[PDB]
Amino acid sequence: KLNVSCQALQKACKLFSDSGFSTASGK
Amino acid sequence: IGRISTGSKSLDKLLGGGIETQAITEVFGEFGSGKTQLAHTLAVMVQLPPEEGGLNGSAMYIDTENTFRPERLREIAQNRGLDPDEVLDNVAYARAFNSNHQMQLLYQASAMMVESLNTDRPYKLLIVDSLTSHFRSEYIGRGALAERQQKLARFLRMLHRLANEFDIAVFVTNQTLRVYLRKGKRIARLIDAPHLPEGEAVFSITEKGIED
Ligand SMILES: Nc1ncnc2c1ncn2[C@@H]1O[C@H](COP(=O)(O)OP(=O)(O)O)[C@@H](O)[C@H]1O
Ligand SMILES: *CCc1cc(CC*)nc(N)n1
């Protein structure tokens, strides 16, 4: 499982205003 | 404007070296035409040095049609002389169960790319399998077309932004650069390429993924 912090997700939404990912191994 | 090799020399000459970053390459074709096999192959090829046709990068795979196969990446990596476990560690995967979740994943992808920067293996490839699958299934009727078209257009704009901002190659499959695949030797045809010459290329699907 590849975790993204709430903070990182907020920055992403901000950058493009103007369940998730896992490695193939299963992390 | 880095280039990722498809694993096939003839397909690479047709694309002018392979798929480009800061661009969206769309491969359209019926079931078994090689689209998903080409996506799995690119997820391995990107991890190679540029002398070997890759970009020393990591890959992201958005699966909408339950087509992602880690054991297929393992086989392609092994038969190309790469370590399969390291290849599997460098491919991030997420399954989209509906159009909304599919768009939401692009924000989570944006976040991982920022983090992947400053590392030796940044993300260089984003794959979206069956880009229109959910849009077609959820939007049936002339009335829903406006929302269907706008939602797809919005998703594509976000893919372009992600590509132009993180210098990544975007690769999408469908049932800018358009490539039509059709049926062991499959054929690829360029659709009015803006800078590349009109033409076709013959390729095979093997234990090494895509190759001549
Ligand atoms: N492990 C494999 N080794 C060799 N050929 C394979 C393997 N897996 C799939 N194929 C070939 O790929 C074809 C499916 O192609 P694919 O690109 O995945 O279709 P789609 O894009 O419509 O999901 C199969 O018909 C088969 O010939
Ligand atoms: C943690 C807050 C947050 C942000 C976003 C996108 C910007 N989505 C969700 N679900 N939660």
CSV table of C-alpha atoms and ligand atoms in Angstrom, one decimal:
chain,number,residue,atom,x,y,z
A,1,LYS,CA,0.0,0.0,0.0
A,2,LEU,CA,1.4,3.4,-1.1
A,3,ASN,CA,0.1,6.0,1.4
A,4,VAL,CA,-0.3,9.7,0.6
A,5,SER,CA,-0.7,12.2,3.6
A,6,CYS,CA,-3.8,14.4,3.7
A,7,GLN,CA,-1.4,17.3,3.4
A,8,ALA,CA,0.2,15.9,0.2
A,9,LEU,CA,-3.3,15.3,-1.3
A,10,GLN,CA,-4.2,19.0,-0.5
A,11,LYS,CA,-1.1,20.3,-2.3
A,12,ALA,CA,-2.1,18.1,-5.4
A,13,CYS,CA,-5.6,19.5,-5.4
A,14,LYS,CA,-4.2,23.0,-5.1
A,15,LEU,CA,-1.6,22.5,-7.9
A,16,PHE,CA,-4.5,21.5,-10.4
A,17,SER,CA,-7.1,24.2,-9.3
A,18,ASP,CA,-5.6,27.0,-11.3
A,19,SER,CA,-8.8,3.5,-2.4
A,20,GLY,CA,-5.4,4.3,-3.7
A,21,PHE,CA,-2.1,2.9,-5.1
A,22,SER,CA,0.0,-0.1,-4.1
A,23,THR,CA,3.3,-1.4,-5.5
A,24,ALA,CA,2.8,-4.3,-8.0
A,25,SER,CA,4.2,-6.6,-5.2
A,26,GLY,CA,1.1,-5.7,-3.1
A,27,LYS,CA,2.5,-2.9,-0.8
B,1,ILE,CA,10.9,15.0,-24.2
B,2,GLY,CA,12.4,11.6,-23.1
B,3,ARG,CA,11.4,8.5,-25.0
B,4,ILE,CA,10.4,5.0,-23.7
B,5,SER,CA,11.1,2.0,-26.0
B,6,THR,CA,8.0,-0.3,-26.6
B,7,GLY,CA,10.3,-3.4,-26.6
B,8,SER,CA,9.8,-3.6,-30.5
B,9,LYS,CA,12.4,-2.0,-32.8
B,10,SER,CA,9.8,-1.6,-35.7
B,11,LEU,CA,7.2,-0.1,-33.4
B,12,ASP,CA,10.0,2.2,-32.0
B,13,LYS,CA,11.0,3.4,-35.5
B,14,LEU,CA,7.3,4.2,-36.3
B,15,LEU,CA,7.0,6.3,-33.0
B,16,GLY,CA,10.3,8.0,-33.7
B,17,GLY,CA,12.2,6.2,-30.9
B,18,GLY,CA,9.3,5.3,-28.6
B,19,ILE,CA,6.6,7.0,-26.5
B,20,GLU,CA,7.4,10.7,-25.5
B,21,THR,CA,7.1,12.4,-22.1
B,22,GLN,CA,5.1,15.6,-21.8
B,23,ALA,CA,2.7,13.8,-24.1
B,24,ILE,CA,-0.3,11.4,-24.1
B,25,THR,CA,0.0,8.4,-26.4
B,26,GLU,CA,-3.3,6.7,-27.0
B,27,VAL,CA,-3.5,3.0,-28.3
B,28,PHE,CA,-6.9,1.9,-29.6
B,29,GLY,CA,-7.9,-1.6,-30.7
B,30,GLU,CA,-10.1,-4.6,-30.1
B,31,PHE,CA,-9.6,-7.2,-27.3
B,32,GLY,CA,-6.2,-9.0,-27.9
B,33,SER,CA,-4.8,-6.3,-30.3
B,34,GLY,CA,-1.8,-5.8,-27.9
B,35,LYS,CA,-2.8,-2.6,-26.1
B,36,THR,CA,-2.6,-4.1,-22.5
B,37,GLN,CA,0.5,-6.1,-23.4
B,38,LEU,CA,2.2,-2.9,-24.7
B,39,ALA,CA,1.2,-1.2,-21.3
B,40,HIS,CA,2.8,-4.0,-19.3
B,41,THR,CA,5.9,-3.9,-21.5
B,42,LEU,CA,6.3,-0.1,-21.1
B,43,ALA,CA,6.0,-0.5,-17.3
B,44,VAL,CA,9.2,-2.6,-17.5
B,45,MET,CA,11.0,-0.7,-20.3
B,46,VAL,CA,10.8,2.7,-18.5
B,47,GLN,CA,12.9,1.3,-15.6
B,48,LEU,CA,15.9,0.6,-17.9
B,49,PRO,CA,18.8,3.2,-18.5
B,50,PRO,CA,18.3,5.4,-21.6
B,51,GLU,CA,21.0,3.4,-23.6
B,52,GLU,CA,18.6,0.4,-23.1
B,53,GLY,CA,15.5,2.4,-24.1
B,54,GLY,CA,14.2,3.4,-20.7
B,55,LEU,CA,14.4,6.5,-18.5
B,56,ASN,CA,15.7,5.0,-15.1
B,57,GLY,CA,12.1,5.6,-13.9
B,58,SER,CA,9.1,4.1,-12.1
B,59,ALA,CA,5.7,3.5,-13.6
B,60,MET,CA,2.1,4.1,-12.5
B,61,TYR,CA,-0.7,1.8,-13.8
B,62,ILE,CA,-4.4,2.8,-13.5
B,63,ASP,CA,-6.5,-0.3,-14.2
B,64,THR,CA,-10.2,0.2,-15.1
B,65,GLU,CA,-11.0,-3.2,-16.6
B,66,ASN,CA,-9.3,-5.7,-14.2
B,67,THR,CA,-6.4,-6.3,-16.7
B,68,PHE,CA,-3.2,-5.6,-14.6
B,69,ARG,CA,-1.0,-8.7,-14.1
B,70,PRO,CA,2.0,-8.5,-11.7
B,71,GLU,CA,3.0,-12.1,-12.8
B,72,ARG,CA,3.1,-10.7,-16.4
B,73,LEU,CA,5.5,-7.9,-15.4
B,74,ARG,CA,7.6,-10.7,-13.6
B,75,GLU,CA,7.8,-12.8,-16.8
B,76,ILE,CA,8.7,-9.8,-19.1
B,77,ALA,CA,11.4,-8.6,-16.5
B,78,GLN,CA,12.9,-12.1,-16.2
B,79,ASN,CA,13.0,-12.8,-19.9
B,80,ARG,CA,14.6,-9.4,-20.5
B,81,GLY,CA,17.4,-10.1,-18.0
B,82,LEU,CA,16.1,-7.8,-15.2
B,83,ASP,CA,15.4,-8.6,-11.5
B,84,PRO,CA,11.6,-9.3,-11.4
B,85,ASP,CA,11.2,-8.3,-7.7
B,86,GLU,CA,12.9,-4.8,-8.2
B,87,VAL,CA,10.7,-4.3,-11.3
B,88,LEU,CA,7.5,-5.1,-9.3
B,89,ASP,CA,8.7,-2.6,-6.5
B,90,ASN,CA,9.0,0.2,-9.2
B,91,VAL,CA,5.4,-0.2,-10.6
B,92,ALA,CA,2.6,1.5,-8.6
B,93,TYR,CA,-0.9,0.1,-9.4
B,94,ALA,CA,-4.5,1.2,-8.5
B,95,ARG,CA,-7.9,-0.2,-9.7
B,96,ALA,CA,-10.6,2.3,-10.7
B,97,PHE,CA,-14.1,0.9,-10.1
B,98,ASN,CA,-15.9,3.9,-11.6
B,99,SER,CA,-15.1,7.2,-13.5
B,100,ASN,CA,-15.1,9.3,-10.3
B,101,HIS,CA,-12.5,7.1,-8.5
B,102,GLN,CA,-10.4,7.2,-11.8
B,103,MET,CA,-10.1,11.0,-11.6
B,104,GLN,CA,-9.5,10.9,-7.8
B,105,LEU,CA,-6.4,8.7,-8.4
B,106,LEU,CA,-4.8,11.4,-10.5
B,107,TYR,CA,-4.5,13.6,-7.4
B,108,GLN,CA,-2.9,10.7,-5.4
B,109,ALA,CA,-0.6,10.2,-8.4
B,110,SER,CA,0.4,13.9,-8.5
B,111,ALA,CA,1.4,13.5,-4.8
B,112,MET,CA,3.6,10.4,-5.4
B,113,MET,CA,5.4,12.0,-8.4
B,114,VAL,CA,6.4,15.1,-6.3
B,115,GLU,CA,7.8,12.6,-3.7
B,116,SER,CA,9.4,10.5,-6.4
B,117,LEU,CA,11.3,13.7,-7.5
B,118,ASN,CA,14.8,14.0,-5.8
B,119,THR,CA,15.0,10.2,-5.9
B,120,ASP,CA,17.1,8.1,-8.4
B,121,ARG,CA,13.9,6.4,-9.8
B,122,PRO,CA,11.3,9.2,-10.3
B,123,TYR,CA,7.9,8.2,-11.9
B,124,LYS,CA,8.3,8.6,-15.7
B,125,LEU,CA,5.3,6.7,-17.0
B,126,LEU,CA,1.5,6.9,-16.1
B,127,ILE,CA,-0.7,4.1,-17.7
B,128,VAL,CA,-4.5,4.4,-17.9
B,129,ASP,CA,-6.0,1.1,-19.3
B,130,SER,CA,-9.5,1.5,-20.8
B,131,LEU,CA,-9.6,5.3,-20.4
B,132,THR,CA,-13.2,5.5,-21.6
B,133,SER,CA,-14.5,2.1,-20.2
B,134,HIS,CA,-16.3,3.6,-17.1
B,135,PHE,CA,-17.4,6.8,-19.0
B,136,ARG,CA,-19.2,4.6,-21.7
B,137,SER,CA,-20.7,2.3,-19.0
B,138,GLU,CA,-22.0,5.0,-16.6
B,139,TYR,CA,-23.2,7.4,-19.4
B,140,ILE,CA,-25.8,5.8,-21.7
B,141,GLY,CA,-28.3,8.1,-23.5
B,142,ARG,CA,-27.9,11.4,-25.5
B,143,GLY,CA,-28.7,13.3,-22.3
B,144,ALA,CA,-25.6,12.1,-20.4
B,145,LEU,CA,-23.2,12.7,-23.4
B,146,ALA,CA,-22.5,16.3,-22.3
B,147,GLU,CA,-21.3,15.2,-18.8
B,148,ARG,CA,-19.7,12.1,-20.4
B,149,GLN,CA,-17.6,14.2,-22.8
B,150,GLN,CA,-16.8,17.0,-20.3
B,151,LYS,CA,-15.7,14.4,-17.6
B,152,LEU,CA,-13.4,12.6,-20.1
B,153,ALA,CA,-12.1,16.0,-21.4
B,154,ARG,CA,-11.4,17.1,-17.8
B,155,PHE,CA,-9.5,13.8,-17.1
B,156,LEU,CA,-7.4,14.2,-20.3
B,157,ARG,CA,-6.6,17.9,-19.4
B,158,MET,CA,-5.4,16.6,-15.9
B,159,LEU,CA,-3.2,13.9,-17.7
B,160,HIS,CA,-1.7,16.6,-19.9
B,161,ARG,CA,-1.0,18.8,-16.8
B,162,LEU,CA,0.6,15.9,-15.0
B,163,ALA,CA,2.7,15.1,-18.1
B,164,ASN,CA,3.9,18.7,-18.7
B,165,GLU,CA,4.6,19.3,-15.0
B,166,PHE,CA,6.4,16.1,-14.0
B,167,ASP,CA,8.0,15.4,-17.5
B,168,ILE,CA,6.2,12.0,-17.6
B,169,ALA,CA,5.0,9.9,-20.5
B,170,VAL,CA,1.2,9.2,-20.4
B,171,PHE,CA,0.0,6.0,-22.1
B,172,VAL,CA,-3.7,5.3,-22.4
B,173,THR,CA,-5.6,2.4,-24.0
B,174,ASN,CA,-9.0,2.7,-25.7
B,175,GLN,CA,-11.3,0.0,-27.2
B,176,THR,CA,-2.5,13.5,-28.7
B,177,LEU,CA,-0.6,10.7,-30.5
B,178,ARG,CA,-3.1,8.1,-31.7
B,179,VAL,CA,-2.0,4.5,-32.6
B,180,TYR,CA,-4.4,1.9,-34.0
B,181,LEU,CA,-3.6,-1.8,-33.2
B,182,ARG,CA,-5.1,-4.8,-35.1
B,183,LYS,CA,-4.4,-8.5,-35.6
B,184,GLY,CA,0.6,-13.8,-34.0
B,185,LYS,CA,2.0,-10.7,-35.8
B,186,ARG,CA,-0.1,-7.6,-34.8
B,187,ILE,CA,0.0,-4.4,-36.9
B,188,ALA,CA,0.3,-0.8,-35.6
B,189,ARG,CA,-0.9,2.3,-37.7
B,190,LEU,CA,-0.2,6.0,-36.8
B,191,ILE,CA,-3.3,8.2,-36.9
B,192,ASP,CA,-2.4,11.6,-38.4
B,193,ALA,CA,0.7,12.0,-36.2
B,194,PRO,CA,1.5,15.7,-35.9
B,195,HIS,CA,5.3,15.4,-36.2
B,196,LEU,CA,6.0,11.8,-37.1
B,197,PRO,CA,5.5,10.4,-40.7
B,198,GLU,CA,2.5,8.3,-41.7
B,199,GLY,CA,3.1,4.5,-41.6
B,200,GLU,CA,2.7,1.0,-40.1
B,201,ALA,CA,4.7,-1.5,-38.0
B,202,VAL,CA,4.5,-5.3,-37.4
B,203,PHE,CA,5.1,-6.6,-33.9
B,204,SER,CA,4.7,-9.8,-31.8
B,205,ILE,CA,3.4,-10.6,-28.2
B,206,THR,CA,5.9,-13.0,-26.6
B,207,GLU,CA,7.3,-14.1,-23.1
B,208,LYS,CA,9.3,-10.8,-23.3
B,209,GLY,CA,6.0,-8.8,-23.8
B,210,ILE,CA,6.1,-6.8,-27.0
B,211,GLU,CA,9.0,-7.4,-29.5
B,212,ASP,CA,9.7,-7.6,-33.3
C,1,LIG,N1,2.1,-14.4,-20.8
C,1,LIG,C1,1.8,-14.2,-22.1
C,1,LIG,N2,2.7,-14.7,-23.0
C,1,LIG,C2,2.4,-14.6,-24.3
C,1,LIG,N3,1.3,-14.0,-24.9
C,1,LIG,C3,0.5,-13.5,-24.0
C,1,LIG,C4,0.7,-13.5,-22.6
C,1,LIG,N4,-0.4,-12.9,-22.0
C,1,LIG,C5,-1.1,-12.4,-23.0
C,1,LIG,N5,-0.7,-12.8,-24.2
C,1,LIG,C6,-1.3,-12.5,-25.5
C,1,LIG,O1,-1.9,-11.2,-25.4
C,1,LIG,C7,-3.2,-11.3,-26.0
C,1,LIG,C8,-4.1,-10.3,-25.2
C,1,LIG,O2,-3.7,-9.0,-25.5
C,1,LIG,P1,-4.1,-7.6,-24.7
C,1,LIG,O3,-3.3,-6.5,-25.2
C,1,LIG,O4,-3.9,-7.9,-23.2
C,1,LIG,O5,-5.6,-7.2,-25.0
C,1,LIG,P2,-6.5,-6.0,-24.4
C,1,LIG,O6,-5.6,-4.8,-24.7
C,1,LIG,O7,-7.7,-5.9,-25.3
C,1,LIG,O8,-6.8,-6.2,-22.9
C,1,LIG,C9,-3.7,-12.7,-25.8
C,1,LIG,O9,-4.6,-13.0,-26.8
C,1,LIG,C10,-2.3,-13.5,-26.0
C,1,LIG,O10,-2.1,-13.9,-27.3
C,2,LIG,C1,-7.1,15.0,3.3
C,2,LIG,C2,-8.1,15.9,2.5
C,2,LIG,C3,-8.5,15.4,1.2
C,2,LIG,C4,-8.1,16.1,0.0
C,2,LIG,C5,-8.6,15.5,-1.2
C,2,LIG,C6,-8.2,16.1,-2.5
C,2,LIG,C7,-7.6,17.5,-2.5
C,2,LIG,N1,-9.4,14.5,-1.2
C,2,LIG,C8,-9.7,13.9,0.0
C,2,LIG,N2,-10.5,12.8,-0.1
C,2,LIG,N3,-9.3,14.3,1.2
